[PDB]
Structures are given as C-alpha cells and as structure tokens.
C-alpha cells in the first residue's frame with residue numbers, strides 16, 4: 001500500500017542518517033577515501049529515496065488524499081533543498097575545499113531535520 005511504501009521510504013531515510021554519520025566521522029578523521037565512497041552511497045540513497053517519495057505523492061494524488069498531497073508537496077520541496085546542499089557538498093569535496101564541506105555538512109543536517117518534522121503528519125494522512 002502507500003503506507004508500506006512510506007515505511008520503506010522512512011527506512012531509506014534512516015539508512016542515509018546512518019551512512020551520513022559514518023561519513024562525518026570519516027571526514028573529521030581525515031579518511032578521504034572512505035568519504036568518497038560514503039558520498040557515492042549517499043547519492044544512490046538519495047536517488048532511491050526520491051523515487052519512493054515520488055511514487056507516494058503520485059499515489060496520494062490519484063487517491064484524492066488532499067491532505068497527504070499537501071504535506072508530501074511540502075516535504076518534497078524541503079527534501080530537494082537538502083539534495084541541492086548535498087550536491088554542493090560533493091562539489092566541495094571534489095574541489096579539496098574542507099571549509100565549505102564542513103559548512104554544508106552542518107547545513108544539510110539542519111535542513112533534513114526540518115523536513116522530518118512533517119513525517120508524523122504524513123504518516124497519519126496517507
């Protein structure tokens with residue numbers, strides 16, 4: 001159902017939290033080869049998460065679930081802000097710019113946490 005797709009989406013978000021925290025530790029420790037790999041893994045997780053979110057939103061639209069559509073539109077907009085910051089972080093890593101990388105890491109943490117405050121409402125509305 002749209003709910004089992006939402007639980008999978010939630011699990012993928014949690015996988016990203018796990019891999020992100022491991023990546024942050026590796027960045028702090030100077031292990032650039034590990035960071036590179038975690039960044040690739042986070043990019044794949046973003047693509048998969050986005051695909052699950054799009055299927056949930058499309059199914060809520062086809063079901064006429066107006067409140068779920070509203071909440072999913074808001075959440076996906078914030079999700080995309082996160083993804084844009086993530087892309088800038090990857091670019092800073094490629095460019096050898098640790099100052100910007102650290103800043104984007106902190107910013108991405110705050111933007112993703114902001115979007116997660118909509119999760120309980122979405123789960124209830126689906």
Ligand SMILES: Nc1cc(F)ccc1C(=O)O
Pocket residue numbers: 012013016017020042043044045046047049082086108112
């Ligand atoms: N795939 C991700 C990567 C990040 F760095 C942060 C968040 C996500 C996510 O899918 O929520």
